[PDB]
Amino acid sequence: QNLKSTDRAVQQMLDKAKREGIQTVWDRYEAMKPQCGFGETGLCCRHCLQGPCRINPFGDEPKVGICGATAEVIVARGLDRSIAAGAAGHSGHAKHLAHTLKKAVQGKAASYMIKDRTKLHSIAKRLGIPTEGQKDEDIALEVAKAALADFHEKDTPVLWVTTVLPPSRVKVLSAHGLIPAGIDHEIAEIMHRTSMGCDADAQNLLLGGLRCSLADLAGCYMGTDLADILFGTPAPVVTESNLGVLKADAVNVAVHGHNPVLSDIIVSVSKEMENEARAAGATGINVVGICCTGNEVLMRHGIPACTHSVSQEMAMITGALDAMILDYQCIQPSVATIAECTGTTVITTMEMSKITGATHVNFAEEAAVENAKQILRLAIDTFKRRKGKPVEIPNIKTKVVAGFSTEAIINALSKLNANDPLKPLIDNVVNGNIRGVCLFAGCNNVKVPQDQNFTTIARKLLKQNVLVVATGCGAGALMRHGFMDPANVDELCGDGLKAVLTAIGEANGLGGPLPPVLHMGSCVDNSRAVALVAALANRLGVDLDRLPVVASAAEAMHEKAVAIGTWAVTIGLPTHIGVLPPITGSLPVTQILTSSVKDITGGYFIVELDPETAADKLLAAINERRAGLGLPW
Amino acid sequence: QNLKSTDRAVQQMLDKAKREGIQTVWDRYEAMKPQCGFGETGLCCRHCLQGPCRINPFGDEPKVGICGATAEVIVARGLDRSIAAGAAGHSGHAKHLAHTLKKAVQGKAASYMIKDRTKLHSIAKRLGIPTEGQKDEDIALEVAKAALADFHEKDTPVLWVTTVLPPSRVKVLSAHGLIPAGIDHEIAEIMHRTSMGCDADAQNLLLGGLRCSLADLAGCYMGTDLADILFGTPAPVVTESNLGVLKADAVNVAVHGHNPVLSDIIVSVSKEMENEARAAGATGINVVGICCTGNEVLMRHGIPACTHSVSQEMAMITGALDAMILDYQCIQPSVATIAECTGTTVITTMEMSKITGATHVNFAEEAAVENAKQILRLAIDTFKRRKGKPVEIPNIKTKVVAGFSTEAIINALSKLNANDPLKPLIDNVVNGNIRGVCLFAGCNNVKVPQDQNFTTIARKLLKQNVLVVATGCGAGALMRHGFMDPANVDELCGDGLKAVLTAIGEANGLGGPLPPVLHMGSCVDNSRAVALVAALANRLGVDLDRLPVVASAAEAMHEKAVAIGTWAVTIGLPTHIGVLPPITGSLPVTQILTSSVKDITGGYFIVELDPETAADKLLAAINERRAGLGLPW
Numbered sequence A, B: 001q002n003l004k005s006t007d008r009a010v011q012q013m014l015d016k017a018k019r020e021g022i023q024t025v026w027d028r029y030e031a032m033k034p035q036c037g038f039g040e041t042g043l044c045c046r047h048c049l050q051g052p053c054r055i056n057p058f059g060d061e062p063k064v065g066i067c068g069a070t071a072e073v074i075v076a077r078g079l080d081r082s083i084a085a086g087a088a089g090h091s092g093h094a095k096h097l098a099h100t101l102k103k104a105v106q107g108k109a110a111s112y113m114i115k116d117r118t119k120l121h122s123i124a125k126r127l128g129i130p131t132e133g134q135k136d137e138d139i140a141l142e143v144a145k146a147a148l149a150d151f152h153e154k155d156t157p158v159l160w161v162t163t164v165l166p167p168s169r170v171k172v173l174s175a176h177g178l179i180p181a182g183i184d185h186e187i188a189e190i191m192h193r194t195s196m197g198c199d200a201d202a203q204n205l206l207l208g209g210l211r212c213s214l215a216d217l218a219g220c221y222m223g224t225d226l227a228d229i230l231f232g233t234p235a236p237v238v239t240e241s242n243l244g245v246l247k248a249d250a251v252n253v254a255v256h257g258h259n260p261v262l263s264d265i266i267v268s269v270s271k272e273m274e275n276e277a278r279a280a281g282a283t284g285i286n287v288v289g290i291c292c293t294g295n296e297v298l299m300r301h302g303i304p305a306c307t308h309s310v311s312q313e314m315a316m317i318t319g320a321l322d323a324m325i326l327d328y329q330c331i332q333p334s335v336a337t338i339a340e341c342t343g344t345t346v347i348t349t350m351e352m353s354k355i356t357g358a359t360h361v362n363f364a365e366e367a368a369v370e371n372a373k374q375i376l377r378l379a380i381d382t383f384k385r386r387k388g389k390p391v392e393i394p395n396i397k398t399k400v401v402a403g404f405s406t407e408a409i410i411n412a413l414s415k416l417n418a419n420d421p422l423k424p425l426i427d428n429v430v431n432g433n434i435r436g437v438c439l440f441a442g443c444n445n446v447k448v449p450q451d452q453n454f455t456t457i458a459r460k461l462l463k464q465n466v467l468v469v470a471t472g473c474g475a476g477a478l479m480r481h482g483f484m485d486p487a488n489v490d491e492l493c494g495d496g497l498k499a500v501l502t503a504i505g506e507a508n509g510l511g512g513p514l515p516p517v518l519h520m521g522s523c524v525d526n527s528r529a530v531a532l533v534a535a536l537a538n539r540l541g542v543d544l545d546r547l548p549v550v551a552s553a554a555e556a557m558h559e560k561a562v563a564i565g566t567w568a569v570t571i572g573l574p575t576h577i578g579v580l581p582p583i584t585g586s587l588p589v590t591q592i593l594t595s596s597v598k599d600i601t602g603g604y605f606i607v608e609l610d611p612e613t614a615a616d617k618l619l620a621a622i623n624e625r626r627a628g629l630g631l632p633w
């Protein structure tokens, strides 16, 4: 099972699933081999009913699409549609939060409120919205309106791009026509330009892609902004991760998907229903997180993370998962069928994300508490149905210190320098105690032994004094392997990095260092990393493409991860991807994405499937940036 | 060559292309065989980097996607993305027209103006925009704003759906949650819900699809409305079609793509540059149309149609095509390479639709005349470069009577009944002189011998007294085979239909009938057919799903054609498609689309590749509707 996952809890559940004849994602992957090489290389097109078209990567015919689309057009069009799809996910998420905020402050959803007034005001200020003499509810109404306005064309570009990157960066992007006009506008334009008989120039197509990726960034940043207003900006919190956070004697409820609009209420209402759960013979309701929505409630409330991404089915295989509460994105639809075998009640809540065989309980913000109770009562009934049934929860969990929003990081650093909080970080970059910064982001992928790339790359970078920050299932991987436990600093960290983590932790009263890796939250919270890096850029008076900062989507899967990688490149970062995106069928496209794009944005993709080699390449990219700033490396 | 195209001009150019070693769309199709059966059946998914996933239509593994996506989810997701892509094309088109109108009435684009004031006012009235005491420019500004507002969420649904279908129909659609909230909103939501780990219920997915198809309808209707305001509502016009409209001694300029914003100016400016063309040794500038933008200028100005869709390369093969002026959609990118062999100057004009190797001349509405002259001067230079070169223009063309907007049709009918213009049509439906109405729409497809389905089906229906109307490349096919020449009425039409066409033509002073088939314009002008059918519905006090009206996308290709078929079903029409959409890999999806959707919208797909059988099925659908209305059949 170590060939499937490096997570021992997952390995244990894989053995149980095998024993019980429950098919997993790894089994479905094995059944899919060998996968289509046309798809793998990007040399397939189904954009019209004359298709499917394919192009042999090498050899003889077919060499070109039926309409005349070249390999470079077909590859660039496919990529662009993946970026649009990612943008559409993050922007649906952000939009849901925008309408929730609007409803809350209009008196239409009393379960929701302005929890972070400081965040609300700072956002308003960043957007140009007056706060002076204004009611919080009116400021928030204006913020929600601005959010919604960024989805379409108007007299300004997307503010959740132009107001979050340094002017120098906006200027570079504007010069290349890369600033999004509207989030959904860009999504639609991509779908248009990539449809048959439209855009058929690789560079032009890819430039569209870059612009659409910035629409994704806007959605991410908007989602983080709005979730923070509604649910609070994360601060450092201690919790646990992995399957051992499940409790046989509790009603175990997984929140799974992405939107804190749902999970945050589940968390609060679950505490209110403890006695009712105890009436049913449980100790209480044990809310645990899967995927980003788990990350959301982990960051804000210290809700323990059960598992992530590719291993999500394994939580069910324990036999102790009474409910899995879903909104949207990254939910393997296998869960609905597996539920039948495991007893788990899988519940969908969003009109646009149903799964055949799951129970659907409409969630309306207007009735959030009511709907939460209905959902949690299904979970209690399910707990009761497994009275006397043996469960196998691997007794495996790690300690996780998380909640490192950018505000939290700045606050942490401020204990070393109150009025110039970024300076201590920069001082240590300059003196070599911090070599650079690496953001690990994105998914696991069934193609890569689970977590192997994240942990292999993270280990190499940490020994080389790289400050490692993480989001999404990258944070998931690292937390589950102990990288968020400060007790592991001595083992994992180079002396310089240890020195810095220790200095900061001790100034924050911890008697010990910050953790080896800083958990910056969910996938939309990649925007937090952007805020940090942009703040550093602003503090240094240079653009992001001069900073020793890189990203690694080490085990990428979702279209959202492709969108995030692409905007990481677009804002000026060397961006590693540890799985093959469908681009190798076109050398010119590959060359643009991995080389010539440097001349446009300063960022670039580093496609590297071998994690040791990926780590060297990321270190090289970091060190090149250091040299560019005149620093030793 | 008759196995490739039933068009003799195209056959002649195919022989020339063969002789000269110029690869065509048919050659590229041959090189693609056998095509991937996974793609053909819809049983392939590339929505994440764990893919590509495929499912064997029959047999053993793989049976399910790696994430657990079933055949029915994979098929429905692929379909939904095609609908979104179509919607995105039509909505990009409509949006371009909306900004052009805005610019025109704000004094920013003097080449453009309100040409149809009556249309402007009636649209304003349909939308609820006051005109009484208002300046035309302000009414138009409000119309343009309403247009743009329909792209995003607001306090009303998409008005270019809710104000164009009868209230009963809107009520049925609203009951099923099918009314679009915003055009680009729906496009984005589709891309979201079809991304990995989101929507995974076929019915739910398909309902999303239906709603997105109505966003496409809105874009179509908006495009027609706005083009009519700007460029004039078509009325009956006589012109010609096929390759023989090219003239060896003229500067031959094809307008190709979709948007009249471009082609309409090319047409007007070309007349202004006659003497300059004559200075270059040409008789003048011979503007000819390809695809929809050709249809646009044909409908309004009687510009002759050169060719359509699948045979577009053949115009170049003549050696006489001096320029091909492109905006977007349905342009085979092969044209850029073929241009090198044929001498044709291929010119792109839209930022989001470039083709490697073509000359790009940015077109800005603000500089439309200037940009047109620059473009046309490239064409004149190209004419000069072929001085003394032999050309082979097939001396093959048909007479085309076209320009049958719904307003034109109503006006035609009004000559028989001034104050109840629809009644004569209905009278003849009731007495059997008109059996029903069939709309032919959409593309040619290299899989179907060009035009064979359109003409085979049209012939059968016309003999059975069906009133045949046509748009896009369906109109193209029929015009090129003589179906728009009133001289062919005796041959083609049943006695009843002939009686009616003759009665209407004679009342309009023609001394002869209307043509066998009524050309209702471009693909967005499928919305004209909706206006006609909705007007009939309103006049009869019944919904569209009770009317003896069907559609046939007999040789469909583009995602736009899939979107149009899908909204034809959604508004309540039996809708034939004569190519296999990628749905046969899922019986449940196929069953929804061809049967159970009847219970939702009253419309349904009729998938039939055999055109004789398709015609019988369409006649059966028409006759069922007649029986439902208590009429003989």
Ligand code: SF4
Binding pocket: A045, A046, A047, A048, A049, A050, A051, A052, A053, A065, A066, A067, A068, A069, A074, A195, A196, A197
């Ligand atoms: S758009 Fe071109 S390459 Fe793609 S399926 Fe259609 S004919 Fe083939």
Ligand code: SF4
Binding pocket: B045, B046, B047, B048, B049, B050, B051, B052, B053, B065, B066, B067, B068, B069, B074, B195, B196, B197
């Ligand atoms: S979304 Fe599911 S079926 Fe599609 S490629 Fe990814 S794992 Fe395969």
Ligand code: FES
Binding pocket: A036, A037, A038, A039, A040, A044, A045, A052, A054, B036, B038, B039, B044, B046, B052
């Ligand atoms: S030929 Fe396999 S992905 Fe299309």
Ligand code: FES
Binding pocket: A036, A038, A039, A044, A046, A052, B036, B037, B038, B039, B040, B044, B045, B052, B054
């Ligand atoms: S396996 Fe051929 S279309 Fe994907």
Ligand SMILES: [Fe+2]
Binding pocket: A257, A258, A291, A292, A329, A330, A472, A523
């Ligand atoms: Fe996520």
Ligand SMILES: [Fe+2]
Binding pocket: B257, B258, B291, B292, B329, B330, B472, B523
């Ligand atoms: Fe068209």
